[PDB]
Design an enzyme around this catalytic site. Structure first.
Site, PDB file in Angstrom:
ATOM      1  N   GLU A  35       0.802  -1.221   0.000  1.00  0.00           N
ATOM      2  CA  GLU A  35       0.000   0.000   0.000  1.00  0.00           C
ATOM      3  C   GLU A  35       0.848   1.290   0.000  1.00  0.00           C
ATOM      4  OE1 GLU A  35      -2.987   0.387  -0.830  1.00  0.00           O
ATOM      5  OE2 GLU A  35      -4.216  -1.313  -0.221  1.00  0.00           O
ATOM      6  N   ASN A  46      -7.754   8.881  -5.781  1.00  0.00           N
ATOM      7  CA  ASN A  46      -8.488   7.856  -6.513  1.00  0.00           C
ATOM      8  C   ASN A  46      -9.350   8.483  -7.600  1.00  0.00           C
ATOM      9  OD1 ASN A  46      -9.175   5.960  -3.442  1.00  0.00           O
ATOM     10  ND2 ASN A  46      -7.485   5.769  -4.824  1.00  0.00           N
ATOM     11  N   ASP A  48     -12.431   8.384  -8.144  1.00  0.00           N
ATOM     12  CA  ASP A  48     -13.739   8.893  -7.772  1.00  0.00           C
ATOM     13  C   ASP A  48     -13.658  10.194  -6.976  1.00  0.00           C
ATOM     14  OD1 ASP A  48     -12.854   8.075  -5.259  1.00  0.00           O
ATOM     15  OD2 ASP A  48     -14.544   6.773  -4.865  1.00  0.00           O
ATOM     16  N   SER A  50     -11.964  10.631  -4.071  1.00  0.00           N
ATOM     17  CA  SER A  50     -11.472  10.333  -2.752  1.00  0.00           C
ATOM     18  C   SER A  50      -9.964  10.192  -2.829  1.00  0.00           C
ATOM     19  CB  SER A  50     -12.094   9.050  -2.237  1.00  0.00           C
ATOM     20  OG  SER A  50     -11.665   7.959  -3.004  1.00  0.00           O
ATOM     21  N   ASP A  52      -6.598   8.157  -0.615  1.00  0.00           N
ATOM     22  CA  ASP A  52      -6.161   7.117   0.319  1.00  0.00           C
ATOM     23  C   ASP A  52      -4.992   7.689   1.149  1.00  0.00           C
ATOM     24  OD1 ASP A  52      -7.866   5.056  -0.749  1.00  0.00           O
ATOM     25  OD2 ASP A  52      -6.328   4.369  -2.115  1.00  0.00           O
ATOM     26  N   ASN A  59      -9.280   5.080   2.867  1.00  0.00           N
ATOM     27  CA  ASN A  59      -9.993   5.969   1.940  1.00  0.00           C
ATOM     28  C   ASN A  59     -10.952   6.940   2.576  1.00  0.00           C
ATOM     29  OD1 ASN A  59     -12.505   6.139  -0.261  1.00  0.00           O
ATOM     30  ND2 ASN A  59     -10.436   6.102  -1.159  1.00  0.00           N
ATOM     31  N   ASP A 101     -15.631  -5.388   8.342  1.00  0.00           N
ATOM     32  CA  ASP A 101     -16.816  -4.901   7.591  1.00  0.00           C
ATOM     33  C   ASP A 101     -17.466  -5.979   6.736  1.00  0.00           C
ATOM     34  OD1 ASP A 101     -18.410  -2.510   7.203  1.00  0.00           O
ATOM     35  OD2 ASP A 101     -17.628  -2.386   5.187  1.00  0.00           O
TER      36      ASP A 101
END
EC number: 3.2.1.17
Length: 129
Positions: A35, A46, A48, A50, A52, A59, A101
């Site tokens: 990462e 990212n 969209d 957003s 990280d 995110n 999650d």
């Protein structure tokens, strides 16, 4: 902060990630390697809109607030900047929520692509833990 491999392993272990939701420490070190290359300051936009943040590239659409991601949920209740600290506590706490999650560590696409199915225990080799 750029952590050493064993240095990060020890930190993650101190904070309770070894075997957290059944993921051994090697998995978490491997995920952080691919990462962030063990860099707490790592940030990546990212597609969209957003971004990280941090050692585990968490995110801003779901987990933290960065003030520029519309329809942010901020499920970890933290500013994304907290995920860049040399102190990994906020990243660990948030990572524990994420891995709980439902999809385990598949939530980290880098873990799926470069850790999953590999000998992840290699990542803690040599370390005094």
């Amino acid at each position: 902060k750029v952590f050493g491999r064993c240095e990060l392993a020890a930190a993650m272990k101190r904070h309770g990630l070894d075997n957290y939701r059944g993921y051994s420490l090697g998995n978490w070190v491997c995920a952080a390697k691919f990462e962030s290359n063990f860099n707490t300051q790592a940030t990546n936009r990212n597609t969209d809109g957003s971004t990280d943040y941090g050692i585990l590239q968490i995110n801003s659409r779901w987990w933290c607030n960065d003030g520029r991601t519309p329809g942010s949920r901020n499920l970890c209740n933290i500013p994304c900047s907290a995920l860049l600290s040399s102190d990994i506590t906020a990243s660990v706490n948030c990572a524990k929520k994420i891995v709980s999650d439902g999809n385990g560590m598949n939530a980290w696409v880098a873990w799926r692509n470069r850790c999953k199915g590999t000998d992840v225990q290699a990542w803690i080799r040599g370390c005094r833990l």
